[PDB]
């Protein structure tokens, strides 16, 4: 649904979708050959099906070709300042693929807008849909376009076939949000039986490790998934299938 969305929004008023309550098989995403840029900040593009996440964000764009480099941590530039800000400690992937077919009409497809004037750079994931006229001088504008009074939005266009870095790149961005809470979106692993009192290599809801899983006497609260020790290491775990 998110990847094959009918139409996306422009970068300035970008659409955010919430993804949860499932299993997910990202390996098909990596094995597509349809994605010109598949770069991730922290993950192996592989092995991504061995993880568990609480909330998976899907942000998605109409940015320009030469611009894709800016959808990344630590970048600075036109979109990365007033249109979309990734945080420094971003934990996700940035999937880009030029859709010139979908939106590039002769005489240019102009549906897609971007803020060009802004007083201050955005905070991470901050979205600004303000349509106030930009006061670029010392005199008030009062919604009157003219000198030092410019509407802060502009239309990209994306000429049909004139884009080498001037083409629509629907940059979908996954932001992987984990509270060390109930993970909810994690990949197709077969939940084998459980073995007790024996050293095993376990993977509970994305929490990995090696140890001896024994019956406890601790009293967990209904909202708690796992205890911890003084060392910040895992101490007790709730079986996600058996309470």
């Amino acid at each position, epitope marked *: 649904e998110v990847f094959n969305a009918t139409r996306f929004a422009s970068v300035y008023a970008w659409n955010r979708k919430r993804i949860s309550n499932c299993v997910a098989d990202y390996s098909v995403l990596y094995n597509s050959a349809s994605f010109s840029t598949f770069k991730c900040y922290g993950v192996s593009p592989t092995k991504l099906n061995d993880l568990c996440f609480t909330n998976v964000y899907a942000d998605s764009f109409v940015i320009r070709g030469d611009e894709v480099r800016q959808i990344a941590p630590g970048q600075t530039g036109k979109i990365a300042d007033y249109n979309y800000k990734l945080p420094d400690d971003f934990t996700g992937c940035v999937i880009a693929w030029n859709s010139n077919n979908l939106d590039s009409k002769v005489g240019g497809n102009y549906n897609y807008l971007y803020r060009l004037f802004r007083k201050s750079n955005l905070k991470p994931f901050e979205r600004d849909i303000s349509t106030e006229i930009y006061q670029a001088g010392s005199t008030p504008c009062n919604g009157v376009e003219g000198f030092n009074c410019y509407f802060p939005l502009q239309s990209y266009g994306f000429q049909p076939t*004139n884009g080498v870095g001037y083409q629509p790149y629907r940059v979908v961005v996954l932001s992987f949000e984990l509270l060390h809470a109930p993970a909810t979106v994690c990949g197709p692993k077969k939940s084998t039986n459980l073995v007790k009192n024996k050293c095993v290599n376990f993977n509970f809801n994305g929490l990995t490790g090696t140890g001896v899983l024994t019956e406890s006497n601790k009293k967990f609260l209904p909202f708690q998934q796992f205890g911890r020790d003084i060392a910040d290491t895992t101490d007790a775990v709730r079986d996600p299938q058996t309470l």
Partner: antibody
Amino acid sequence: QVQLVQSGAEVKKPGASVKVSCKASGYTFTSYYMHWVRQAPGQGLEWMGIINPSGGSTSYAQKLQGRVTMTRDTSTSTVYMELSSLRSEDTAVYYCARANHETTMDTYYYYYYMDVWGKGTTVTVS
Amino acid sequence: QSALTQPASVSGSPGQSITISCTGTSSDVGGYKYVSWYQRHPGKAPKLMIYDVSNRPSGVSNRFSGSKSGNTASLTISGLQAEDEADYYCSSYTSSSTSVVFGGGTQLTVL
């Protein structure tokens, strides 16, 4: 003297196909776009679609599926306008229009400024 | 979208100023800064005076100005004459199926 000329008028009955030209003058034919606007009787002006003199890439209004194919000629700087399966409301004054910027690489200015014009060419269908 | 809304006919007097309204959709005028107006001398070709809402081609008399707010574009003619009697059409790019929309038109009759 940058000026656009189509052919004379046509008299059609429904179901036919019609050939409208538009030669250009006074500029570089491969730079600007060619826009096309008609005037239905009593209702205002109406754009079909366009064609790029550089490559010939086409597009048009959804409401005009399959009933329009825009062709062109770079050698004579002439662009051609086609409308098949003609109906009564197709009676209109058909204009050829030039874009107010040259096709430019890595561009920003949008290419729908309708600024240079044909004399006009009325279609009669009944 | 649909055809824009223009007054059917506005009259006045020479030297007096008359303004013409143009209402559309937020996807026709309110999302964009691309309003352009036109005029019809009877039996003649269009002529562009307005584009970039308040901007102008070279050679248009300083009597015609364009304005923008909300869903309303507007054209103002300062110092009217019988020279000015014509039909008037506002145009805009749209963020939808089509790309260009026009108003119904306005006949300015000089009395």
